[PDB]
Amino acid sequence: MVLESTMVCVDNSEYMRNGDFLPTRLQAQQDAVNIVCHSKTRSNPENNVGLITLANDCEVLTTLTPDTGRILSKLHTVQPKGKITFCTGIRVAHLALKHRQGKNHKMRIIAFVGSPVEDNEKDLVKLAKRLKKEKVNVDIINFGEEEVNTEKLTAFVNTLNGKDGTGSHLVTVPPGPSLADALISSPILAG
Amino acid sequence: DVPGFLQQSQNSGPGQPAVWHRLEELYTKKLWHQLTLQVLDFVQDPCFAQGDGLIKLYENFISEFEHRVNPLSLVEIILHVVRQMTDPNVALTFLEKTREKVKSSDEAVILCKTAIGALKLNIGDLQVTKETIEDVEEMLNNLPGVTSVHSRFYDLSSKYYQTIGNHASYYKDALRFLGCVDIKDLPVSEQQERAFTLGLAGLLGEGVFNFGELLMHPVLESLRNTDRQWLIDTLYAFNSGNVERFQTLKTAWGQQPDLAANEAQLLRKIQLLCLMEMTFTRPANHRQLTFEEIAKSAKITVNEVELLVMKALSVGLVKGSIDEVDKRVHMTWVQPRVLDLQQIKGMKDRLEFWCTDVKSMEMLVEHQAHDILT
Amino acid sequence: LHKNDIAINELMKRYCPNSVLVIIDVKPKDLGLPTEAYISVEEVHDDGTPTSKTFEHVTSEIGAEEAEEVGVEHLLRDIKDTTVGTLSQRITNQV
């Protein structure tokens, strides 16, 4: 089958609990993680999935493992503190990709961003240049918004994404009554 | 009540619709966090505090049933409510309601009891308030050392400093206030009276002998540049010691109230200063001294020096015991405390000398020792 | 000693009880005691600085239980015991 590693980042902030959009969509995207990890389990059960947040202090809840049994139990106690962090959130994952068991597995990291980026364009294009240098697949997913959806983020993705052929895809979800599951299941990255 | 809110939201004063536009926009967007931010920005603005009685209660209710945003903001705005209305009667009921409404995730009970105590710091209650204050400071020894809550606690200790009961505690907390300083963003005009009552508390503080610790941190002397130098002069005089009684007499008669009864006590406090300074003056070259210099500097007779050194041994800052028969004065271990420049020069000097001596002896001995023994 | 070490030790401060930190050298060129035991506690600062994790030095000694002494002594066959006398004492008195 397909050999790759899956890294999912969840937003522990209070912006996910807002009353306009979904009623604490954290559980919804949790169910998304569940159905996509069960999908990967059905396809290639030998894949491991790690879990960490975007907050200031990076704390791994569960190390990468093929068994999601205890992971489902570790999906709780999100510890709703902090706001957002980007750079070290990347450096705690992409640099930690070398701690995986199988060396034949491809590097794949996604993210759930529910908060505005505090970092300027410089750090963005630099980190994008780094990820492009080490050649790691990155899928940008943003749940909820305040300011304009894509402004510098477009150029960010374009500069971050190399190998136009069968490369990474950008996921942009607008406001709506529908869930995020079938919406993030639309690209080829899911299933 | 959302569709019914539009009626009283639309109608407002002359300048209110300016912020009310963004307010109603964030209200239609149903953003609770942005709503709270807009509320704090509204409170930050110098409102007339007249027709805000409705929006205070409205935002109070909203903050009550939203169960999302940090309740501490609700505590702040309800403190503004009890500040504007000045009604301590329903204040207890409101605070109790806020304590009962909030669930248990993180503990805000420290700031809640801080607010309760602060409102109870009036002439109504004293002892029990001090007790629950002790409870508050005994609450969290854990990681949240942000000290902001402890800064509000320092304000509580200032309201406690309004009482003449304990001068020492406010100074011990003033050290914490001296160490928790962040930036200059806060008004200097307030810092004038702050450093003023700080100077008074430091001067009248019986829990401290030398004032050099207060003058040690650069922020105070940097913030006192605008203020008159009469305080800095006598503080630096108390720091470097007084060889003259004229200036300290001038600062003794400088402040009329409450300084008269404590004047002699301050004299008994600073009489040890010349002692510790003179015993910390010469580290070598005949440490042995006499009461002549002491009586000359402190302008006191030979009869009171026994009671003077008796008090010196009563405090416990000096272990000095003189075995003399004929008239003599022996000195002992003393604390450098704040700083000395000549003792730094002497430090590096004696240290360099000791080091090169140990090195010289080591090389000298080991020279033959390695050859004839090995 | 890196600044991140407080965050590294914070994990074992949460999950486990209070942890002791030990600092050694990568190259044994240090003649002094290579092992320094540092306890992790929160102490009240006199200057008034915010409360943070502070490393306090704790005295330590290097020793073995039973068989480890034998193993070391056998693997070395160089170092000597206390051996009260002239050379053993004068070596110390020199170095």
Give me the secondary-structure topology.
This is part of a larger assembly, with chains A (191 residues), B (374 residues) and C (95 residues).
Chain A: E1 4-10, H1 26-43, E2 49-53, E3 62-65, H2 69-74, H3 87-91, E4 106-113, H4 121-134, E5 137-142, H5 152-160, E6 171-172, H6 181-184
Parallel strand pairs in A: 1-2, 1-4, 4-5, 5-6
Antiparallel strand pairs in A: 2-3
Helix pairs in contact in A: 4-5
Chain B: H1 2-10, H2 16-28, H3 32-44, H4 53-66, H5 71-85, H6 88-101, H7 109-119, H8 127-137, H9 148-161, H10 168-179, H11 188-204, H12 212-216, H13 218-223, H14 230-240, H15 246-252, H16 263-279, H17 291-297, H18 305-315, H19 342-372
Helix pairs in contact in B: 2-3, 4-5, 5-6, 6-7, 7-8, 7-9, 9-10
Chain C: H1 5-14, E1 20-23, E2 36-42, E3 53-58, H2 67-76, H3 86-94
Antiparallel strand pairs in C: 1-2, 2-3
Protein name (chain C): 26S proteasome non-ATPase regulatory subunit 7
Organism (chain C): Homo sapiens (Human)
Family (chain C): Belongs to the peptidase M67A family.
